[PDB]
């Protein structure tokens, strides 16, 4: 079966990883108190 | 303190699910040919 020409590679550079992890961890640090209540 | 018993799993999954998503994407970017 012939390959789909609409396929594209995906990227996340290191800075984006660090920015993303910061977002997730700080959001969890913020929301955790309310989850525990 | 009598905290909600689902607070721990809620927090752990809140952290782990998206962090893992990002880690997956980063590592597969690095492994691509340069």
């Amino acid at each position: 079966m012939e390959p789909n020409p609409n396929r594209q590679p995906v990227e996340l550079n290191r800075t984006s990883l660090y920015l993303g992890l910061l977002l997730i961890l700080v959001l969890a640090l913020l929301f955790s108190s309310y989850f525990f209540n | 303190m009598e905290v909600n018993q689902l607070g721990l799993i809620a927090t752990a999954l809140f952290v782990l699910v998206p962090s893992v998503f990002l880690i997956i994407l980063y590592v597969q970017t690095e492994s691509q040919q340069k």
Partner: peptide
């Protein structure tokens, strides 16, 4: 358990600071 959770998240953040500073992608002039 809550305290462990809070301290854990905090510790991960400080670790992130470390990697983001010392193991950053080096800025390069092309």
């Amino acid at each position: 358990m809550e305290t462990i959770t809070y301290v854990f998240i905090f510790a991960c953040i400080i670790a992130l600071f470390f990697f983001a500073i010392f193991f950053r992608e080096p800025p390069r002039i092309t």
